[PDB]
Amino acid sequence: VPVTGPGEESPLSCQQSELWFLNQRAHLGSSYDNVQMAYRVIGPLDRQAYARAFEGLVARHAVLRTSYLRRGDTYVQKVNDTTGFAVAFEDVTGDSAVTEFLRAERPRPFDPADRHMLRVHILTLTPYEHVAVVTRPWGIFDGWSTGVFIAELNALYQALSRGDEPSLPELPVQYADFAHWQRRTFDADARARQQAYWRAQLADLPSCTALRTDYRRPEAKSYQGSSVEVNVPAAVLDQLKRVSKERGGTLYMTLLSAFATLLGAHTDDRELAIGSPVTNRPRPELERLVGYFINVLVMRLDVRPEQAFDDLLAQAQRVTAAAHEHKEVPFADLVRDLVPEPDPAYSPLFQVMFNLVPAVALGFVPLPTDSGTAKFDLNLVVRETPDGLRGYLEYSTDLYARSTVRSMAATYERLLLKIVTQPGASLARLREAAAD
Amino acid sequence: VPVTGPGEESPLSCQQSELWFLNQRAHLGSSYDNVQMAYRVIGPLDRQAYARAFEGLVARHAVLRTSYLRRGDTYVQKVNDTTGFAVAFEDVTGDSAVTEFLRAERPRPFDPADRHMLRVHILTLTPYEHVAVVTRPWGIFDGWSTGVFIAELNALYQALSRGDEPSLPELPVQYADFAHWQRRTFDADARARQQAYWRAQLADLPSCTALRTDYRRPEAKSYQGSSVEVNVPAAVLDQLKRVSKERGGTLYMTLLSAFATLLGAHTDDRELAIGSPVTNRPRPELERLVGYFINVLVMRLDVRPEQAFDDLLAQAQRVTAAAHEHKEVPFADLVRDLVPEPDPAYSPLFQVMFNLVPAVEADPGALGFVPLPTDSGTAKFDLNLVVRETPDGLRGYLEYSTDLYARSTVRSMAATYERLLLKIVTQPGASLARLREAAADGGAG
């Protein structure tokens, strides 16, 4: 319900506890974590109409035009009018020039006091070829919001180029209203209950995972990394979705179990802590908004090699269900409460992350950009697509070489198929089968 | 003379005003400016002997073992012992893996209160090939100190490889003794005089150059950049030296004049502010130390197109001669005095830098060295020409900000510079405009 008026300051969210400037690193830089999205537009493009489409898209969503102010010991979010935003134009010749311009564009600092958290550039190569550049800092909005952003941009441009009136569904509630609703629902009791549950669940947990690396762990993390591509065919993904249904779980649980089985071949521990970002949209009005609804949970999973993968999958389902009940407490609070002094050589409470994002005339070709960053030792971000299962494995170059991570992705691809074919075997047998 | 005892606190020298923790940037990080020196050691290397040679350097050179501790609103240098230093050994298979390892290791932080201010990695590739990574923060030692460091490393390694003992010339003084002398060798008057000279010399100057760029200038500098190669034949260098000695100047003056003439084709200002780093080692004792002895001086040149090149050469001689007499006050102090509020769009007090690196001065089973190209993709200035003298001619690169320039424009600028040098060689008394239009015969790139 609307509980926000003009000139009123709203608090933050549980998922807004790690935007980009609440996780500052001294040796890395404030803007090392910016998110840049670039597209190539093909065909006769009404450039002014496309700029107006971006203007209207910014004016439609209030997260793209919200500021952050320091009120004593805490911060508040304020909504600004779309006045001031403008799409910048530049004539660029060649692909290498575009790449160099993008590399120069991404690390430009964003400020908490910025009126707009977005930077839009249209690069004019030819009268028929253009490049659209979208840049934001970390913690602004997630992949769901990105798909909504792109779809609404395309619709509004199509409705505005040929002099028509744009027609898009009205957004029922604002993000600030959602934060206000969560504040009054989650004040002091459920927070304490979830914190106690995570304290008891994550008890007697090692501070770090004894994962074997190619290079010695430095006394301080550099957070420089790369990524390698992982691809799963559509038939294997369909078979995974089928085998997940028979066990009463979802595809995310099966894929997380596969990731846990992958990591047991490089560690001697029996308990693996795998972080995982999960969507928290507990209302019908939130499936359409643009914003950050993602929170991080640690999956404490027993990885004894002698247990059959069915038992592992059931244990993973139970752990996810128990964590899905306690997904409201921010991960930063858990880290600061359970690790008072973080060792600068590794990431707190887990060193491996798994992510699964749900499935989402001019021609559009996305421009891949490698940020060259790694917040964890490993990070799996996989996507659901009509032609299969596509994603990347983000690794740290302090500890790992490229070849080992590529082999890890390949054996993960083999492991998914081996799980599909023979789910009745144990983890040791599964890894032995996937060794070849 | 040595006036320092063990475990005694010492003040900071003038060239130490720019190490890393007094020139931090919020969005760049603490370790964006780390100087990674990497080179390939080819042939049979005694890896443990090489590590012992680096340790002997750390023991010999107290700068590589000095800590920096805050005492109030300043910093002091305390010379720790040689205990603690060790060489990290890693096994790397592949040059792309080496490049990724270098990119990851370079931004690893250094602490002001560390016991040793260098990281040495002997990346093992094959039994007869190695990569020696000497990563240090900015301001630890400079190019001349880099040459001294490399020569002493070679001497120590050649002494320790076989069953011999180290035999190196004894160092009469230490950098702490140099700092004590430098703080003694003024009565609060030299700083005032040099500050007054530099504030009077740069007065009535634009806060930024009106140079033409391919792209519009962003609100904040991204500090990303690239470079293009500059190459000059040996004969052209010899003729340039002949012209310089005929006119009563040096090679640096002629190259700076040529650089200023090149920049006139891309601007409408009648004056140019060009920054340049210079060596300050005013003692025979300091000529073989390891340390930081570089200050940055800015050269102001008039580039009106109706004047002959000889007038520009004379003006360059005058300004360079006057600059070397006032090369003690740090450039950071000049920036603080003359620039109250810096603009994040451009570098302060100058956006073009010209650098002339001083020149650097046989067993069957010796080792070969190949300096790995360390292009960090950083740019502190809009344009940065860095050249050095070699027996094969003149070598260097032209560093440009990627926020403003495409590669083709800077490549055309480099070609125009190399053509203008030859035009100057073959035409002594031409005019600036005539030289520019003669050097423009590049066929539009």
Side-chain angles (χ1 to χ4, degrees), chain A residues 1-17 19-164 166-186 188 190-192 194-203 205-267 269 272-332 334-359 361-428 430-431 433-435, chain B residues 1-186 188 190-362 364-445:
Chain A
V1 297
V3 288
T4 56
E8 210 187 9
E9 302 176 354
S10 178
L12 269 73
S13 178
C14 290
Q15 302 99 320
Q16 287 180 298
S17 81
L19 288 152
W20 87 89
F21 63 102
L22 310 165
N23 303 113
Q24 285 287 320
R25 314 213 170 285
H27 78 100
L28 265 187
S30 80
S31 79
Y32 87 101
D33 199 3
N34 289 349
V35 178
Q36 185 184 68
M37 188 174 60
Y39 299 96
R40 183 197 280 125
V41 189
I42 305 306
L45 160 72
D46 200 334
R47 219 176 73 195
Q48 305 306 133
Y50 209 71
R52 286 190 295 166
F54 267 111
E55 295 286 329
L57 196 67
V58 166
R60 179 154 157 88
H61 308 295
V63 294
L64 308 165
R65 40 187 180 85
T66 182
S67 299
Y68 299 108
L69 313 179
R70 182 168 174 81
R71 287 296 184 254
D73 203 21
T74 180
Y75 279 88
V76 292
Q77 57 193 355
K78 187 187 287 185
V79 186
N80 320 293
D81 59 311
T82 188
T83 286
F85 170 78
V87 177
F89 293 97
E90 273 304 331
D91 280 308
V92 179
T93 308
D95 287 16
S96 46
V98 167
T99 302
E100 201 174 2
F101 189 89
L102 292 185
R103 276 183 279 115
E105 197 274 324
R106 193 195 60 76
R108 270 162 213 173
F110 288 92
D111 211 13
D114 272 1
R115 293 188 69 267
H116 312 268
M117 284 322 167
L118 183 63
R119 275 197 305 257
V120 184
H121 289 258
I122 298 174
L123 310 188
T124 312
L125 281 84
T126 59
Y128 298 94
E129 196 166 30
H130 290 67
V131 169
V133 185
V134 176
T135 298
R136 72 210 203 249
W138 190 267
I140 293 301
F141 64 79
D142 45 20
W144 196 325
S145 301
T146 301
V148 171
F149 188 91
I150 292 291
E152 293 207 357
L153 175 75
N154 284 357
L156 194 152
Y157 170 63
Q158 260 174 349
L160 204 65
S161 72
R162 50 176 76 118
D164 300 330
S167 72
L168 288 161
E170 284 295 323
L171 295 166
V173 291
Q174 208 191 17
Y175 200 95
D177 296 323
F178 152 82
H180 273 152
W181 160 83
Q182 212 175 42
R183 194 171 67 138
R184 280 192 290 267
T185 299
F186 201 80
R191 162 192 279 270
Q194 296 191 39
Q195 187 171 358
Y197 161 75
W198 276 118
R199 194 190 302 271
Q201 161 80 8
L202 296 180
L205 210 73
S207 295
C208 175
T209 305
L211 281 165
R212 293 186 294 277
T213 71
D214 306 286
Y215 315 127
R216 293 297 90 196
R217 184 177 286 276
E219 307 94 296
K221 216 162 168 306
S222 83
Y223 297 90
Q224 307 288 300
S226 185
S227 49
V228 301
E229 293 295 326
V230 61
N231 301 293
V232 181
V236 194
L237 164 67
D238 270 344
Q239 270 197 300
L240 275 168
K241 296 174 78 69
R242 202 207 68 225
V243 74
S244 158
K245 207 182 152 142
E246 314 155 26
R247 271 70 178 171
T250 77
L251 179 83
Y252 158 80
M253 287 162 203
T254 310
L255 286 182
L256 163 68
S257 289
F259 197 38
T261 316
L262 181 73
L263 301 162
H266 310 282
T267 190
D269 289 333
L272 283 181
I274 310 182
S276 193
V278 299
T279 296
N280 193 14
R281 286 178 195 256
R283 270 291 157 274
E285 293 81 6
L286 312 174
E287 279 93 11
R288 193 48 50 192
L289 301 173
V290 162
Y292 210 73
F293 294 89
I294 287 295
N295 201 352
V296 185
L297 318 173
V298 169
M299 303 292 106
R300 172 170 186 151
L301 188 45
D302 194 350
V303 291
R304 294 179 293 173
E306 65 267 13
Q307 65 173 348
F309 187 80
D310 291 331
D311 304 344
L312 172 64
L313 188 60
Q315 218 284 343
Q317 299 177 352
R318 183 171 61 248
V319 165
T320 49
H324 285 144
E325 187 176 359
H326 315 93
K327 63 166 68 172
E328 298 275 328
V329 61
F331 189 61
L334 289 185
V335 160
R336 73 169 174 84
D337 295 335
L338 278 298
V339 186
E341 287 299 323
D343 199 303
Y346 43 93
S347 48
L349 278 182
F350 78 91
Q351 283 75 44
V352 296
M353 182 168 249
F354 175 86
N355 189 4
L356 168 67
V357 297
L362 316 176
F364 294 99
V365 182
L367 286 162
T369 77
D370 220 329
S371 190
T373 302
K375 289 209 208 88
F376 316 107
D377 304 342
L378 297 162
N379 186 3
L380 193 54
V381 187
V382 67
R383 196 181 39 242
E384 176 69 24
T385 63
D387 56 354
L389 191 66
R390 280 90 174 97
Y392 61 88
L393 179 50
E394 173 181 352
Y395 65 93
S396 182
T397 43
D398 292 356
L399 315 160
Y400 304 100
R402 172 162 288 259
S403 46
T404 308
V405 185
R406 289 177 58 85
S407 177
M408 275 152 61
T411 188
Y412 180 71
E413 295 160 357
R414 288 167 271 159
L415 187 69
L416 278 184
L417 181 65
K418 289 297 178 72
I419 293 170
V420 163
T421 56
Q422 188 177 2
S426 56
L427 303 202
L430 277 192
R431 278 177 225 139
Chain B
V1 292
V3 292
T4 55
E8 181 177 355
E9 305 304 326
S10 195
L12 289 177
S13 82
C14 294
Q15 294 94 300
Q16 276 175 326
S17 298
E18 51 190 353
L19 287 168
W20 66 101
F21 41 84
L22 321 170
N23 303 104
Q24 296 253 356
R25 299 195 205 274
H27 78 279
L28 261 186
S30 74
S31 66
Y32 67 93
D33 215 357
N34 288 358
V35 190
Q36 187 191 64
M37 304 197 295
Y39 54 88
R40 290 183 177 273
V41 181
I42 311 179
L45 178 76
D46 211 0
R47 202 170 87 222
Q48 290 309 124
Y50 201 67
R52 268 188 307 138
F54 264 102
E55 185 169 355
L57 286 179
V58 173
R60 167 177 172 101
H61 292 295
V63 176
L64 314 183
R65 78 190 175 224
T66 296
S67 291
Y68 312 96
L69 304 173
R70 188 180 182 91
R71 302 281 187 251
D73 48 329
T74 182
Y75 282 64
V76 293
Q77 45 185 341
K78 184 189 165 326
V79 182
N80 306 303
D81 43 356
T82 182
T83 70
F85 176 81
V87 172
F89 294 101
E90 293 293 356
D91 266 322
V92 185
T93 71
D95 177 69
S96 53
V98 167
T99 307
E100 289 179 356
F101 195 92
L102 298 185
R103 179 183 158 266
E105 195 277 325
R106 174 182 164 294
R108 277 170 211 180
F110 281 92
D111 199 80
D114 195 332
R115 279 188 53 90
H116 299 296
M117 298 301 170
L118 73 164
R119 275 194 302 269
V120 181
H121 291 256
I122 300 177
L123 319 179
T124 300
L125 278 72
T126 65
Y128 316 104
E129 180 185 1
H130 284 78
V131 166
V133 190
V134 186
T135 301
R136 61 185 207 263
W138 188 263
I140 290 287
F141 58 87
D142 50 39
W144 186 244
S145 313
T146 299
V148 169
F149 173 97
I150 292 305
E152 271 150 349
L153 173 69
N154 268 341
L156 266 164
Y157 170 73
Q158 285 290 340
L160 288 166
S161 83
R162 47 186 58 91
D164 294 331
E165 282 191 355
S167 67
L168 276 171
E170 196 266 335
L171 286 148
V173 292
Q174 296 265 264
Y175 194 86
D177 304 317
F178 161 69
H180 279 298
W181 183 79
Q182 199 168 48
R183 72 162 174 76
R184 286 193 296 266
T185 312
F186 74 97
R191 290 285 298 275
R193 296 180 198 124
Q194 299 200 14
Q195 183 65 248
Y197 166 84
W198 282 108
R199 78 176 72 185
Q201 166 81 6
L202 301 178
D204 303 337
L205 194 69
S207 53
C208 175
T209 186
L211 203 65
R212 275 89 63 93
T213 59
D214 301 307
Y215 319 122
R216 267 161 269 268
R217 188 179 288 268
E219 190 267 325
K221 206 173 176 314
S222 187
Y223 292 92
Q224 312 292 298
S226 194
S227 65
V228 294
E229 291 182 351
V230 190
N231 276 352
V232 172
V236 190
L237 196 56
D238 293 353
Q239 297 278 351
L240 284 162
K241 291 179 181 178
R242 189 215 86 233
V243 175
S244 300
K245 67 165 51 63
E246 287 178 354
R247 271 71 177 174
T250 187
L251 181 73
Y252 170 85
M253 299 166 182
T254 307
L255 300 190
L256 174 77
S257 291
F259 189 52
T261 298
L262 167 65
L263 298 167
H266 311 256
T267 189
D268 271 7
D269 302 289
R270 295 172 63 87
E271 70 269 358
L272 287 172
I274 316 173
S276 196
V278 75
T279 293
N280 195 1
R281 283 166 181 245
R283 272 310 206 257
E285 293 83 4
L286 313 171
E287 291 212 47
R288 290 301 292 182
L289 263 64
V290 159
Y292 211 73
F293 302 89
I294 301 299
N295 199 22
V296 174
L297 317 178
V298 295
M299 305 302 177
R300 179 138 172 216
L301 295 178
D302 295 15
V303 286
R304 60 174 213 98
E306 292 87 3
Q307 74 182 327
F309 193 60
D310 295 342
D311 296 332
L312 188 67
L313 263 192
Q315 193 210 8
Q317 164 183 357
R318 270 194 270 117
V319 299
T320 55
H324 284 227
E325 298 296 321
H326 302 83
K327 62 166 165 198
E328 186 261 328
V329 55
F331 177 64
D333 287 346
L334 303 180
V335 166
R336 287 192 258 281
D337 189 302
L338 303 151
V339 184
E341 59 182 1
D343 201 305
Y346 44 85
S347 64
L349 275 185
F350 72 97
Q351 291 78 39
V352 291
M353 171 175 279
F354 170 73
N355 212 353
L356 188 55
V357 170
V360 176
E361 279 325 290
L367 307 163
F369 299 80
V370 185
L372 278 167
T374 305
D375 54 354
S376 64
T378 312
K380 294 159 208 200
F381 304 104
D382 293 334
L383 288 160
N384 198 355
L385 181 62
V386 184
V387 288
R388 79 201 173 267
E389 305 177 74
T390 193
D392 209 359
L394 196 77
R395 303 285 93 88
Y397 62 84
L398 180 51
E399 176 186 358
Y400 62 98
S401 168
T402 48
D403 302 270
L404 308 178
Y405 283 109
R407 192 152 203 90
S408 57
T409 302
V410 188
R411 264 171 304 165
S412 177
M413 296 176 68
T416 301
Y417 183 77
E418 307 157 315
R419 188 179 299 113
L420 180 77
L421 287 173
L422 185 64
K423 291 291 183 181
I424 291 160
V425 162
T426 74
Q427 296 186 11
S431 77
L432 290 191
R434 192 264 188 277
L435 276 170
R436 281 170 199 158
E437 64 88 20
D441 296 332

